[PDB]
Symmetry: C2
Subunit: 389 residues, 2 copies
């Protein structure tokens, strides 16, 4: 009887199953939701090894006929987004866009967005949903600025993410319809009569007049927006649950705002926003711990396994803003380490700073056990994050 993957949808405590797997079979054979078999790696040491060993391929997880943890919801070519981006001389436009340094006003503008969104929830009074009222509009607004598009249609863009990022046992119609719908949005914004200045679409319009089709440009835009928005909103929601359940943390923040950096780094270690594992196909037979992994097999990295490993993190179950060291995997590791890590931090640091200043009596409106955790999604997240203040 293989343990079933994925683990619990509930994102406010580490699933007891992640603790058991890391302790008894840090490389366990598991059955994914497709019915394919996989190697789930749940210890820090072995997770870092997989991430840092190039014979475990990310690109190759989209190949036809390989074992899948769930259906492809995007074209095969996009699962190697950083690959293709690098190979087209597009890396510079993308890397300038992802660099927080490269946009001197980003900080002040993110800060202003966070303040106005919370000011709107304070105008109506508690309770409010901090997902629909804060994390979603805030993450959408960041990513509209990164692309250089307006914010008018954020709701329909974030609805695109509600479909794009579904984990299904089999392909579903409408995963592709969804992809081509918002690809179309990105192509229209890029080929606008007042041609787009500002953003990655600004840099893309500059770039296709030098000596890369419209479809690949739109593809990069759409794939960066959905990856960034889904990841930032989900992380921020779990960071918000941490501050609501542990108000001592929001007190430290208010008392000592400069510790927000180290604080977000700990919330990143602790956050359970990743609803699945980082996938790789073995390109060769590899001895990983006590298991022989055959070429062509699927390897699944359990970030929450590694980031809660008591071998590396003392008292891993307890949030601690004063860790001497924090070599966490929340951004992954090796060659596919998140290229937007600095931007992820800046996003969270600013939203969290604004929130503890604007809602100093922030708490869940109801017991944490009664939050609705989203099923069948790449991220764990509360469908609604009702709070009081």
């Amino acid at each position: 009887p293989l343990p079933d993957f994925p683990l619990s949808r509930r994102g406010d405590i580490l699933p007891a199953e992640a603790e058991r797997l890391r302790a008894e079979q840090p490389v366990a054979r598991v059955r994914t939701m497709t019915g394919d078999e996989a190697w789930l790696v749940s210890s820090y040491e072995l997770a870092k090894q997989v991430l840092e060993d190039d014979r475990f391929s990310l690109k190759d997880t989209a190949n036809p006929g390989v074992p899948r943890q769930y259906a492809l919801t995007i074209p095969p070519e996009v699962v190697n987004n950083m690959g293709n981006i690098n190979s087209a001389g597009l890396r510079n436009a993308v890397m300038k866009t992802l660099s927080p340094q490269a946009d001197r006003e980003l900080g002040g503008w993110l800060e202003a967005q966070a303040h106005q969104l919370l000011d709107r929830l304070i105008e109506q009074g508690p309770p409010a949903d901090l997902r629909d009222g804060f994390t979603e509009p805030y993450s959408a607004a960041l990513h509209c600025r990164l692309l250089g598009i307006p914010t008018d249609d954020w709701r329909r863009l974030m609805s695109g993410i509600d479909v794009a990022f579904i984990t299904s046992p089999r392909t579903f119609e409408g995963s592709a319809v969804n992809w081509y719908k918002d690809l179309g949005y990105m192509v229209d914004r890029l080929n606008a009569d007042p041609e787009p200045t500002e953003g990655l679409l600004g840099r893309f319009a500059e770039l296709r007049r030098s000596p890369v089709s419209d479809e690949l440009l739109a593809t990069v835009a759409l794939s960066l927006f959905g990856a960034g928005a889904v990841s930032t909103s989900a992380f921020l929601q779990h960071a918000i649950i941490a501050l609501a359940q542990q108000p001592e943390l929001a007190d430290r923040l208010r008392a000592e705002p400069a510790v927000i950096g180290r604080a977000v780094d700990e919330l990143l270690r602790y956050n359970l926003s990743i609803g699945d594992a980082l996938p790789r196909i073995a390109l060769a037979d590899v001895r990983l711990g006590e298991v022989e992994i055959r070429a062509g097999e699927l390897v699944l990295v359990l970030i929450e396994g590694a980031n809660y490993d008591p071998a590396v993190f003392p008292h891993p179950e307890r949030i601690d803003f004063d860790r001497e060291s924090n070599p966490h995997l929340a951004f992954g590791g090796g060659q596919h380490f998140c290229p937007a890590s600095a931007l992820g931090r800046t996003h969270a640091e600013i939203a969290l700073t604004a929130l503890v200043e604007k809602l100093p009596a922030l708490r869940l409106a109801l017991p944490v056990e009664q939050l609705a955790w989203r099923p069948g999604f790449i991220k764990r997240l509360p469908e609604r994050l009702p709070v009081l203040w």
Copy 2:
């Protein structure tokens, strides 16, 4: 070990458990989510009997000390004042006249928006919620501009919790305050229940007025939106029903009536306190015990409805309990039906290739709510 209540939040099929319960113990001792016990009544004969007998009270369900299927969220005096005329005149679709053509303009505008974006769309946030909110804002004579906020209030108000939670009261007072201010607007409200209430305290506190307004807005928007999502699933999964409605638009009344019998929007049971020792089938219910009517139990009862598991827009007869029965039979039934007839008519006209964007098995069913509903209702056309 007692069977657990409530049953599955899955709303696309009748829970197997409801079938086993109706078959083997149609009056069943269950543990509610509060850990209290109750009698779950799952056959039509006994469901109909509890609803039509006044030895079972709904008002007493809110009394202190009684067993509960879940915690109160609203004040106890809301589960005599000569308002009955203002309220009943509002719940009459034939006192707003333009309602029909207005709701139809609403449905079409909401749908025209999604057709412009192109599929997929979420028919909950893009259709049922804006549409249901629109109805109830017109009912109260208030603008529709704060519909997201108002429907968010419903997301907290209609939670099923084992124990009470803060926020239930905060949420209640936040929106009471909202209704009190629309009641007391400088250009006094004219039109709607508020309009009528304004004229009816010139002839009952502002507290009580906004309290009726808010409970009415609450119960109707949550109920019409949830039912319309089930009817939409029915028409997506069974596109022959949508072909029927395009071919024969006049059957929408019979059709919406069968979709009512079939729908699993009601996610709890209709609660009664026994005001006395009453025998029900083979069970001696003692005074002050909680009785719970499982509507999907009665509406799928084959002793009354042939082939209950199948939707038939052509049944000779359809005496369904979707609106309840006896003294507490839904007072807004016709408004309920009108809401759904006009949205579904508009839906099968505008989106004739309507289908789910994925297998119905993979919809997210909302937990811990009075309604069974899909958190999202993603569709293609």
